[PDB]
Write a protein that binds this ligand. Structure first.
Ligand code: ZN
Length: 60
């Protein structure tokens, strides 16, 4: 792992929301940052609350 952007991963099921692709699994156009999701957005993989999504802005 090594990058920083609007990439979010589900700490619950490990899903991964891509802003450059949009929340297709849910219903959002590409180029949309996870910051544009509503507080009611649910993971399209495990249906968890958007509050369970975390970004990946770290590089080792
Ligand atoms: Zn999930």
């Amino acid at each position: 792992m090594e990058i920083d952007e609007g990439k979010y991963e589900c700490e619950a099921c490990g899903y991964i929301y891509e802003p450059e692709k949009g929340d297709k699994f849910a219903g959002i156009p590409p180029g949309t940052p996870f910051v544009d999701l509503s507080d009611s957005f649910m993971c399209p993989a495990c249906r968890s609350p958007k509050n369970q999504f975390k970004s990946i802005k770290k590089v080792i």
